[PDB]
């Protein structure tokens with residue numbers, strides 16, 4: 001069977017799915033179909049500190065040369081007209097309790113994408129927020145302490161996950177996307193899922209951050225390349241770092257899942273799900289490449305239904 005439901009289930013996927021369908025049952029809209037959330041790939045990686053930061057801080061013994069993390073790719077599918085339609089995807093990076101500072105017990109959303117065919121339309125945004133809120137709730141329970149978001153919308157024609165978006169699906173500019181995450185986090189706050197969130201500038205200030213080595217270092221994030229430039233441009237760049245953090249502060253969220261002294265007393269983070277080896281969905285380039293090479297577009301509902309079928313056949317028949 002090629003259905004989204006028969007894709008391998010996980011605790012993480014089930015938690016998100018249960019939250020979404022719970023919310024949909026409260027809404028009682030007759031157009032809404034069942035939602036399936038599936039983790040389709042999961043692997044362990046390391047991000048290596050780039051050469052400039054490495055020469056300054058790693059070789060003097062002040063910073064780890066690399067940080068291990070688990071990366072997960074997940075998809076949400078909805079029943080529409082009796083078939084599965086993939087409508088949302090997200091990749092995450094999880095730096096567990098064996099990861100050295102400054103990354104210990106942190107999660108980072110690498111990127112997220114969607115195709116706007118969720119039915120009914122009036123519930124689409126709410127469903128996206130429930131998935132994100134569910135993810136924060138889950139990693140909090142496992143023992144992650146801080147979550148990180150970079151609110152950077154794609155450039156015109158740069159598909160993040162889904163090849164060929166619908167032509168009439170508008171791309172939010174930074175201001176709209178920032179408020180969209182704020183709305184999501186405000187709802188997470190009201191449910192006691194997060195303790196607070198802050199911008200990166202306010203966070204560094206409260207932490208009295210004085211060196212670039214204290215800034216969490218994530219694969220593909222803004223800051224490692226900024227830091228390479230600060231070291232090339234050139235002495236202590238800490239003053240300029242605060243100007244850079246301040247200039248871009250609205251787009252960089254720091255989310256506190258736990259706060260206070262408990263954060264140094266938590267048990268080890270042990271992931272109850274196995275890794276899921278799926279080269280096609282690990283990273284974004286493979287799936288984009290495959291869809292491009294096979295003319296799998298998501299630019300209308302009919303094409304999205306077809307491309308979802310083809311993706312499910314690929315996922316099942318490795």
Ligand SMILES: CCC(=O)SCCNC(=O)CCNC(=O)[C@H](O)C(C)(C)COP(=O)(O)OP(=O)(O)OC[C@H]1O[C@@H](n2cnc3c(N)ncnc32)[C@H](O)[C@@H]1OP(=O)(O)O
Pocket residue numbers: 109110111112113114115116124125126128148149150151152153154160169170171172173176177180
């Ligand atoms: C940390 C790293 C990451 O998370 S990646 C950064 C976020 N990811 C992306 O931007 C990928 C592409 N974007 C998307 O897939 C979606 O926009 C996401 C982010 C999922 C949000 O979708 P959604 O919940 O529908 O909110 P939305 O703001 O996109 O649409 C709401 C209404 O606003 C409109 N809108 C959008 N952009 C504009 C615009 N530039 N000018 C005028 N209007 C705009 C939309 O048309 C939409 O209208 P409507 O009220 O739903 O009919």
